Amino acid sequence: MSHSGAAIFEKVSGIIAINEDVSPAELTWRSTDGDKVHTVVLSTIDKLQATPASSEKMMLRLIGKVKPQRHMFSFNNRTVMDNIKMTLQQIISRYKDADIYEEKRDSLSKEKLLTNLKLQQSLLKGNKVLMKVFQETVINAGLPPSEFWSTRIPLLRAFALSTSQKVGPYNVLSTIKPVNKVNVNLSREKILNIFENYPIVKKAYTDNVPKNFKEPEFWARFFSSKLFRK
């Protein structure tokens, strides 16, 4: 199968296997006798090179980030190489893409409005003229802070409603179109909608947030999974 196959490393035959369950995924080749074992972590690997299909001899070489380190594998059957090469390309590109991204990096009741201290500070920080008047009339003047908001209820209510309203439910996944390499864009609002409409994705996400891997890799895996299709 794709995960395992026969290969020759350092002029020694053995079995080459791909392990994706353990994060990060790693490639391990072991000799027939088992005395020789070599393991390479795909995260370090950067570029993958393969001999042209025209050439009779078949080999795959992996060069990682730094006198750069190199790892060369030789196969017996061409079909096994293609399956192994394809799987390695998917993981190598996925890990590379993650590196690129990382490199880039009631409540409306008048009484409650007066009592809502945090809302008052948020409004005052946003507005300048109101803050200027508040400083003059409450710092040196000494007028009670509570009395100041008594005559400005409508302004406070409007500010609160500017962030306490949410859009209606909609088929979030049907809006995502992949548009070989294909670029699909996501937005923070789009991410929130997916979590709200589909709790299963939220359950899958919460587990893998810092633990399994970084957030960006999750969406790449998810959109390439059958769960997204279903």
């Binding site: 390309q89 998917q90 590109s93 996925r94 893409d97 991204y101 992949p178 070989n180 390499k181 294909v182 670029n183 699909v184 864009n185 996501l186 937005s187 923070r188 991410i191 960006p216 969406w219 790449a220 959109f223 390439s224």
Partner: peptide
């Protein structure tokens, strides 16, 4: 067959 994902923020949106 690879999938490219780009998360868009406010700065990217503008």
């Amino acid at each position: 067959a690879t999938l490219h994902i780009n998360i868009t923020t406010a700065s990217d949106e503008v």
